[PDB]
């Protein structure tokens, strides 16, 4: 099998790429192309040829149950041999990853960007028909929730045609023609959703902060946890218009709520929601995680105020490893040599001011250290 | 106790800062200032006041054995109370850290920069007397090996006066006057050491790569491991003048050397028997961020286009379960789980049951991150 690479685009999704390779190389559809691709992987003795799908929907490596390592070996084999000039196909796929969010949400990764798993669309993929007839392909941003408007046309996305039928471009091509009525779909204008769509796309959108793309999706997942509901585009832009003193206003109202509802107060009894729900979003890089960077800025100037209220909050050995980013073996070693001053791992024997100053002594890094929020 | 902050400088060392606070606040030396500082920490009921040293040599928190957590609480207490305007003193100290280098070298951290532990000077600290009489303080770069010339005066550092006596600024002040002869020290000019000194200082030095300061010291420790000797300033700049095709020339010569001298059947070849030196000596320098670790980023670039060439020579290299966790950055509990559900295809942990091409593609499937992923060396 010998193929031709189409016009490359670094924002094209993986399912939109196989349609354009099949249409350029004269195949009938993408079902035929993947079935002929599985035939080629059999002929050169690939170990997981039989797990290569003929369905466009399950092509991505998060779809594969145990073929995840054989799927990316299959994707790396095709880009090196079957093309006149080697394409980029691993950079368009959505891989699983071991990275977790706060508190326990898993994640997926696409090239140089990490997405939340819960914000991945799985029922029906919306689309913009203006991009389908100008760019000629589909973007990866249509697979994730929150991205509701087009960042370059300011038009809302479509999930249903005028005849009640849905339109999925993976099964109905890239042209924009419906299946039942075989007609182009008629379109269905705000500003707050347009700003977030231009912000999630990777461009500078004010007043939203200039963050890497892995961190911009972490704030959207974090904002859905604060309101404890779905994502609101209006209150999200307004919250960062008063940055950082709007985020300071919440933490004051949370500690006034939990004090009224004192030497026995724990860290999970006063700051159990804000602190543990902001550690890994996606990681502890305080240069880019502005939520954990500002929360540690607020708790630094309040350690020994109010007779040491914050610095005397009790902690376990489990939740000490979450803050210090270490293991229970190093915690049990630091009670042997007693760098950390007092074993039951679920026992409250440590104070927050001692854990905060142990981090400034033995557990800083080049990314998780205090020198960014100064 | 009420003190005055001197002129602040973000490159001043910690031992040079306490001398300038004591000289501004009218103390006699730094020995009577730290001893008066220990007296203040006793008066406000600090838990580790009795471990606060009166020696300026052991003022850094890596010198404290068990009281390293009490030392940084002592440093955080002084900056908040005893000054008219709060200084920055935790940012000048040299803390220990849990970060290891390759293969097993420990590390220290100073603010936003991680240093190798073995490159930390412990016998005698050299100095530049021109910076002592112009800037008025000392820099932290004088505490680390490799930094041999001044990056702004291009003069070699001094460890010995003209009368045979050493000059340590921690015990002899910041002026530049010797102890025996009480005279200023007479100085003792290349280019290759001047480039590395301007590169380790944090400025752009060509042809050396634009890296963060935590990674620039990692290359110097790595270059001492390749030659298996001390650091050479001439061959270091020349090696990055032919980047990356000079580093490609070594890996070709290593796999040709190892294959010819292999003691086992070409199919029984292991990853430690062919690439045991280059791969395991480049994982954590300091970490796996392939955006800035250009050694591991280029070694995985070279081994990607050679997996199934030569009848799958690289992709059939045997690995253990121990050295699978080093590459995947995981634990032995997740490895034992992936032999239960069999995402990874075959328990004795020191047994060679896995191939390198399967571990490399399992990483592209289940173990990428925002920093350790393939999308940087494309
Ligand atoms: Zn659009
Ligand atoms: Zn229709
Ligand atoms: Zn200079
Ligand atoms: Zn002299």
Numbering used by the authors:
A (entry chain I): 1 to 188, 193 to 265, 270 to 350, 360 to 391
B (entry chain J): 1 to 188, 193 to 350, 360 to 391
Paper text:
Support for this concept has emerged from recent functional studies on type I-F and type V-K effectors involved in sequence-specific DNA transposition, thereby significantly broadening the potential biological applications of CRISPR–Cas technology. Here we report cryo-EM structures of a V. cholerae type I-F CascadecrRNA in complex with transposition subunit TniQ before (binary CascadecrRNA–TniQ) and after (ternary CascadecrRNA–TniQ–dsDNA) target double-stranded DNA (dsDNA) binding at an average resolution of 2.9 Å and 3.2 Å, respectively.
Cas6 and TniQ can be readily traced in the 2.9 Å structure of the binary complex, thereby providing insights into how the three Cas subunits (Cas8, Cas7, and Cas6) of the multi-subunit type I-F Cascade are assembled in an intertwined helical topology with crRNA and TniQ. The binary complex reveals a 1:6:1 Cas8:Cas7:Cas6 subunit stoichiometry similar to that reported for type I-F CascadecrRNA complexes, but contains a head-to-tail aligned TinQ dimer, whose individual monomers are bound to Cas7.1 and Cas6, so as to facilitate the first step of DNA transposition. Following Cas6-mediated maturation of crRNA, Cas proteins are assembled with crRNA, with the 5′ end recognized by Cas8 and the 3′ stem-loop held by Cas6, which is kinked by Cas7 thumb motifs in a periodic “5+1” pattern. Cas6 binds to the 3′ stem-loop of crRNA, while forming multiple polar interactions with Cas7.1 (left insert). Notably, the binary and DNA-bound ternary CascadecrRNA–TniQ complexes superpose with an RMSD of 2.33 Å. Minimal conformational changes are observed on ternary complex formation in the presence of bound target DNA, reflecting slight opening of the entire complex and crRNA, especially within the TniQ-bound end.
